[PDB]
Symmetry: D2
Subunit: 87 residues, 4 copies
């Protein structure tokens, strides 16, 4: 079956804002050298907790997220996994 996943290494550039089954929302600033901002959505509740409990703003992370795209075109990135590299 078709898929589309994204892997990002970057820094957490926002607070964890929470919405309504809850979800968590935050952005990663990723700068390979030009700085790319990506908004992550989180439903997996264990990860939601892991983020709120342990992870502070400015953390270097490695995130994997499932990606989707029309209305303009909008990118949804739903988190699958997170590695805290440095808090």
């Amino acid at each position: 079956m078709d898929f589309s996943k994204m892997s990002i290494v970057g820094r957490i550039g926002s607070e964890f804002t929470e919405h309504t089954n809850r979800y968590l929302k935050y952005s990663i600033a990723s700068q390979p050298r030009q700085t790319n901002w990506y908004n992550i959505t989180v439903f997996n509740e264990p990860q939601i907790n892991f983020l709120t409990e342990y992870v502070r703003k400015g953390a270097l992370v490695y995130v994997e997220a499932d990606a989707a795209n029309v209305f303009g075109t909008t990118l949804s990135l739903v988190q699958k996994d997170i590695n805290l590299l440095k808090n």
Copy 2:
């Protein structure tokens, strides 16, 4: 620091050529379809695409991702696998 995408999907366009190659992949897990525009500079891959790959091909692409600000996604191809080719 990086941001890369991997996609499996079907090639949903002709290969249009600029000054690099452009094409779109329709990735449809079931059901909604996610359209991704791929940009190709790597010339060997550009040739591989034009010389072998037909529209409707199931492909596995990896691409470097960037976001240019409303916000737009650039996806520059780094690798391609042909999984199954198209009509003839």
Copy 3:
């Protein structure tokens, strides 16, 4: 810290079912992945605990082109363990 493998290849065995010392059921199968057809064919033995995937596989035919992601470890001769995390059926047998 991690070590994961992604494979595209064909299922080159029956699905044999076993018990794991820790007392889990797991499924074993091998993927033949041959990127060249002038180069060798890499055989990789996959272990599956995730029961939904175990069922998904038993309910997949031999020779299927698959895309598998698996956690990798080395266990001691020294051997490679590849525990399945996800599977995409690209084309069946």
Copy 4:
């Protein structure tokens, strides 16, 4: 068809240098990756720009993210070759 590995781990060796069958230069090193039991993986490097990148910038103990092409070579039993395709330095030594 493919079989790539992605590893996050620490460089656990010096960069030892060798030459190939066809007189081609390669670098060897190992990555210790410890998710939680510590997996050692031996990386082979031909891509000369990366060879330089390693020798020039990267110190032992570096946290790295490596992607490597994987192959299995049979003999006599089975051996895993991991040839580096890319490296990210996450934190140096």
